[PDB]
Structures are given as structure tokens and as C-alpha cells.
């Protein structure tokens, strides 16, 4: 692809003698590296950088006004994936973003898997009903996939989504558009993400990725004396997930575990904090926290569950309350803080 440019024949001959293949190859190196390779001088090396940089992109001017006004041209800035409940959508101001990793962390029995299943079901609805008209990919890491609960949810779906007409519901093939994968190791998870997910995403069979418990293998394979390889693996995984989500305009939902706090990270008066440290926290866009209070349900009788927004570039820190029943996860009206 280096011959599409306009260079002097001597420069092209020199760069061909240096076994340089593409524009990414030449932009990968530095000025002194190209000086040592091509045996050129600074002005023509600078001109080569000029030409390559202009080749990658240029001549296009984008302003915030265009992003704000041209909604159809930029679906990332204006389109959100619904959660299946009006109250949760109101808490999230529309739903999940279409570009970036969204975390969901909490203690056991908080209700993360139920939310994952509900999102996997709701991603298949038409555009006007909050969906993306596509399937989903589910990756299991700790336990086996709960198929019985999925069958119950698919059966009960017409009774949860009241707004959608029944005729459109009848033609929806819920079970045929969900793909299930199983992973037993860190290397297996990395290989799966690198190979199987892009194939499914490119063909258009799915527009949502659920890594589920991402902390499960890292908690068991890396100790406190091997933080550097763990950080390297986490950075690679996060970079790959972000690249895939940006390329295919599909949300990525990750489920995380918590550890006892036992506050540089802003977790002073909290009992538990998300695991995997700050290296994993640096890769996220929206951070949520689902919690259950067992000391208050002992008085109420019914479980007390809250969903909280820890951090977001466009959402204030707030919370609401929800319940879990046979239909699925549903929010409680008039509880947002």
C-alpha cells in the first residue's frame, strides 16, 4: 500500500530496500529508527512522515455542532440500548452506550446474571423499542449456563414488555439468536475473545458481548507477587474489547466480583470494592454497582436491592431500587436519588 503515495523514486527505492510494507509499518517506527533504516536525511524523512500521516486520514473537518445535529450519521452519540425497564432506563438516561466497556459489580446474589439475561433478551427488539435488531454472545467462566431460567424468561417475555405489541413478539426467535461459549482458563478466554467473537460480530449475528465474570480466572491464577503479568493480560484484554466495540458499534458488558475494603479510589465508607485493582478500572467507561442489604430485608421481609452509578463521563452519581420476580428484573417507581 506504500505505492499509492507520491514520492520521489529514490525515496521509494530506499524504503523498499528497508523491507517496509505498509503505512502502519512506517508510522510504527520513530525518526531515528527510519534514519538508521533508510539511510536518508531529516527533510525527506519528515516529508515521508507528512505523506504517510496524510494518507491515513485528512482533509475532513469535524465539529461538535455536526455531532450534536447529524444524529443518523453518528449513532454512537445518540442511540442507547434499553434495559427492558423504564425506571432503569431513566436512571441510565436511555440505556447502555454503544461504544465502551460497561462494568457491573456487586456481592453474591445481587442479581447481575438476571440483568445479563434480560439484556440478552432485550437486544433483539426493533429500533423503536430500545433494541438493536440483533442477537447476543454470552461467555461463561465460573458456572454452567442457566438454561432453565432463560427458558422461563423467554416464556414470560410477553408479560414483561407490555409496550411492544404481541404480534411482533410472536415472530421473535429468542433462543436462536443467543450464542453460548464456555471458558476454563485465562489463555482460553484470550483466545476466544481474539478469534471467535470477531467472526460472530463481523457477520452481523450479534451486537452485544457479555464476558460475565471476568475476575474468575484472574483470582485463581495470579497471586500478589505476579502483578505485572496480570496487568499485561488485563491491558491486552481491555484493548481488544474496546477495539471490537468501537469497530462494530456494539456494547460490551462485563460482570465483576467484589472484595472487602478492609481511600485513594474514593471508597472510604463502603464495605466492598470492585476487584482486579486500578489497572482494570482504567479501561472502563461506565461503572455500576448492584447491592443487596440483608440487614434491612430482615425487617422488611422482602429483599432490598439497589443499583448505583459509580462513575460516568455524562451521568451524575445516583441510585434506584429494583426487584426480581418471575418476569425478570424490574425497577421500583419513584425511588431514584
Amino acid at each position: 500500500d506504500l505505492d499509492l503515495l507520491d514520492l520521489n523514486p529514490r525515496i521509494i527505492a530506499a524504503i523498499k530496500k528497508a523491507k517496509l510494507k505498509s503505512v502502519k509499518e512506517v508510522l510504527h517506527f520513530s525518526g531515528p529508527d527510519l534514519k538508521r533504516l533508510t539511510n536518508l536525511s531529516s527533510p525527506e524523512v519528515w516529508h515521508l512522515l507528512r505523506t504517510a500521516s496524510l494518507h491515513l486520514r485528512g482533509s475532513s473537518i469535524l465539529t461538535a455542532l455536526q455531532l450534536h445535529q447529524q444524529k443518523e450519521r453518528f449513532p454512537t452519540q445518540h442511540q442507547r440500548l434499553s434495559l427492558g425497564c423504564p425506571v432503569l432506563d431513566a436512571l441510565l438516561r436511555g440505556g447502555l452506550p454503544l461504544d465502551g466497556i460497561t462494568e457491573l459489580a456487586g456481592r453474591s446474589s445481587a442479581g447481575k446474571t438476571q440483568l445479563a439475561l434480560q439484556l440478552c433478551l432485550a437486544v433483539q427488539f426493533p429500533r423503536q423499542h430500545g433494541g438493536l435488531e440483533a442477537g447476543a454472545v454470552y461467555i461463561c467462566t465460573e458456572d454452567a449456563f442457566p438454561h432453565k431460567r432463560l427458558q422461563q424468561l423467554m416464556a414470560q417475555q410477553p408479560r414483561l414488555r407490555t409496550d411492544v405489541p404481541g404480534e411482533l413478539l410472536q415472530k421473535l426467535r429468542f433462543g436462536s439468536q443467543i450464542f453460548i461459549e464456555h471458558v476454563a482458563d485465562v489463555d482460553t478466554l484470550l483466545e476466544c475473545v481474539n478469534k471467535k467473537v470477531p467472526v460472530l460480530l463481523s457477520r452481523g449475528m450479534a451486537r452485544l458481548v457479555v464476558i460475565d465474570s471476568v475476575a474468575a480466572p484472574f483470582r485463581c491464577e495470579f497471586d500478589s507477587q505476579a502483578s505485572a503479568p496480570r496487568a499485561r493480560h488485563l491491558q491486552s484484554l481491555g484493548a481488544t474489547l474496546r477495539e471490537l466495540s468501537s469497530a462494530f458499534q456494539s456494547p460490551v458488558l462485563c460482570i465483576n466480583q467484589v472484595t472487602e475494603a478492609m481511600g485513594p479510589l474514593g471508597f472510604w465508607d463502603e464495605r466492598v470494592s470492585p476487584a482486579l485493582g486500578i489497572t482494570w478500572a482504567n479501561q472502563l467507561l461506565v461503572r455500576l454497582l448492584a447491592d443487596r442489604l440483608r440487614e434491612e430485608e430482615a425487617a422488611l421481609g422482602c429483599p432490598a436491592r439497589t443499583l448505583r452509578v459509580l462513575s460516568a463521563p455524562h451521568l451524575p452519581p445516583s441510585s434506584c431500587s429494583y426487584t426480581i420476580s418471575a418476569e425478570g428484573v424490574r425497577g421500583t417507581p419513584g425511588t431514584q436519588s
Partner: protein
């Protein structure tokens, strides 16, 4: 009086050919015909023309004129009085400023607030310029910018109404949401090669748009902290980028804002948060700010500055944006 050839940007081949021929000083080739030079040395005539052009390519400003220019050029206010007071008035032009902090502390909010504030009319003490935003993380949301711009417009309208002047009304006639949104230029870089390419293309873009007064690169740690095992190459690229950015800021009278990330340093069985990318990166920036939580408040610390003194202030993030108290 004598200038050696080694100090000139020539290719190694032509330079070694000249050295082997017998040429040692720059002035020695100033009286040699290019055809005769090509004949004796053995280079082509194009090479002789290029080297003669290059060799003939290499004002007087005192501290008083520099002080006058510094006084004439303003600062960029952050709408946080304490931060402006400890910074000397605001973010200074012709300098490189770096912001560090833990996730969810408010760096992107500061970037958006600066992008909005750079356009305040000079009648209110602003600079009246435009901003360039380079996003390497996809965290730029237009709705937040709209909220910040609306809050700034309301604040300026209230100030103008309180003053009850005539110049303020004329200045606020053209300070609308559409112009503010249209005076921000947006770029998205998904890799460090793309970031380098955009930074390379920046000077021509700034030559075309001479009213730009702010350049923001929200995120330099992310492109350089993944899938890069050769750390020497990373350091070389970072040093080159820092030199290019300071040269750009000085040449075009801009303000350069960079955001960094925090890592953990493990010593004496204790964990402390330090800025990433190594120790040699600390020399790159001119001003370094660090954001952190103390108990529940957010603190801004002037870690390094060549003109002011180390301090610490309090700020908070409101629905209107970056504020104080």
C-alpha cells in the same frame, strides 16, 4: 567562523562521500560549482542542489518584550477561583500542562470546561479563541458539553445584566450555543500510530485556523500502555511527542493540555499512587497537576511549576461543570 558538516541535516551517504573527498568545513563548498562538485565527489546534480539548498538554511528578543507579551496574552479561567489563584490566573499559554488522577476524579470534566471557557469574549476577561479536542478513549459526550456551554452562557448573561453596560450586550449577542459548539474541532484516534499521525498533521491545521488557542489530548497513557513490549521505543516516541507539542505550543501561541493515568508503586510493603509512564516522563511537561480524593472531597495539588509554589485546593463537580467549594 568554521562550521562543520556534521552539524547539518544531511544523509549519511552524501556526507561520508564529502568527507572522503576532502571537504571538512561548511564554507569550503560555498565556492564550488555544483557541476564540478558532482564531478569530483561523484554525487548526482540533484544531490548537489539539495545539499547546497540545505546548507544555506541555518530574532533578537529580550526579557522585557517577553514580559510585555506575557502580560498582553491572557489566561484560560477554569471557573474555580482557588485553582486560578494557585495557577497564577489560569492555564498559561505557550506552556504544556499535565493532569493526573485516579479513574472518576474529573479530568475529562476539566477538559470540557476548558474547551468551553477558551471562547469567552475579551470583554469579560477571556481570550476569545477556539479549541481542538483529540479523543483517544471515546469519552467525549456532546450532551455534557451542551450542559456546560448553557451554564456558561447563563453565568455571562447574569454578569452582563448585573453590570448593565452596552459593550457586554454586544459581546453576548454572538455568544450563542451554536457558535460555541461549532468552534470546537473533534478528532478521534484509536491507536498510537493514529495519534502520531494526527499530531504530525496538526501544524498545517493550525496554520489554516489561526484563531485556535487551545489543544487538548485527552489520554496519552492508554495508546502507549498496551501491546508495547519494547520500552525503549516507547520512551523515544514519548520524548519526540513532548518535544513536538512544546514546539507547537510555543510557535502558535497555544495552551497544550495532556491527561495522564495513575499506577501503583510497591515499596517497603506499602502501596502509593504515582503517575504512569516512568520517571523520565516527569521532565516532559511544564506544569503538573494531580487530582485525588482525601476522604470525600476532591483535591487539586500543584505538584510542579517553574513560576508558582506548591499548594492544595478544594473543588467539586456540579451539574453546571467544574466549580469550587
Amino acid at each position: 567562523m568554521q562550521r562543520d558538516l556534521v552539524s547539518f541535516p544531511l544523509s549519511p551517504a552524501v556526507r561520508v562521500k564529502l568527507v572522503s573527498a576532502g571537504f571538512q568545513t561548511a564554507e569550503e563548498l560555498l565556492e564550488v560549482k555544483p557541476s564540478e562538485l558532482s564531478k569530483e565527489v561523484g554525487i548526482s546534480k540533484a544531490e548537489a542542489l539539495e545539499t547546497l539548498q540545505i546548507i544555506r538554511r541555518e530574532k533578537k528578543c529580550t526579557a522585557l518584550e517577553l514580559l510585555e507579551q506575557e502580560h498582553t496574552q491572557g489566561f484560560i479561567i477554569t471557573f474555580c477561583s482557588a485553582l486560578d489563584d494557585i495557577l497564577g490566573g489560569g492555564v498559561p499559554l505557550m506552556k504544556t500542562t499535565e493532569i493526573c488522577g485516579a479513574p472518576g476524579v474529573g479530568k475529562t470534566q476539566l477538559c470540557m470546561q476548558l474547551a468551553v471557557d477558551v471562547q469567552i469574549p475579551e470583554c469579560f476577561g477571556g481570550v476569545a479563541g477556539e479549541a481542538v479536542f483529540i479523543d483517544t478513549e471515546g469519552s467525549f459526550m456532546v450532551d455534557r458539553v451542551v450542559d456546560l456551554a448553557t451554564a456558561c452562557i447563563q453565568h455571562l448573561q447574569l454578569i452582563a445584566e448585573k453590570h448593565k453596560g452596552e459593550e457586554h450586550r454586544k459581546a453576548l449577542e454572538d455568544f450563542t450555543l451554536d457558535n460555541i459548539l461549532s468552534h470546537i474541532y473533534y478528532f478521534r484516534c484509536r491507536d498510537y500510530t493514529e495519534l502520531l499521525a494526527q499530531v504530525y498533521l496538526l501544524p498545517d491545521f493550525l496554520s489554516e485556523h489561526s484563531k485556535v488557542r487551545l489543544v487538548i489530548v485527552d489520554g496519552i497513557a492508554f495508546p502507549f500502555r498496551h501491546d508495547l513490549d519494547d520500552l525503549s521505543l516507547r520512551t523515544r516516541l514519548l520524548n519526540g511527542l513532548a518535544q513536538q507539542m512544546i514546539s507547537l505550543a510555543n510557535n502558535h501561541r497555544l495552551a497544550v493540555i495532556l491527561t495522564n493515568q495513575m499506577t501503583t508503586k510497591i515499596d517497603r510493603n506499602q502501596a502509593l499512587l504515582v503517575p504512569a509512564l516512568g520517571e523520565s516522563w516527569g521532565h516532559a511537561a511544564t506544569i503538573r497537576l494531580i487530582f485525588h480524593w482525601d476522604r470525600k472531597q476532591r483535591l487539586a495539588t500543584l505538584y510542579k511549576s517553574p513560576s508558582q509554589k506548591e499548594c492544595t485546593v478544594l473543588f467539586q463537580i456540579k451539574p453546571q461543570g467544574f466549580r469550587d467549594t
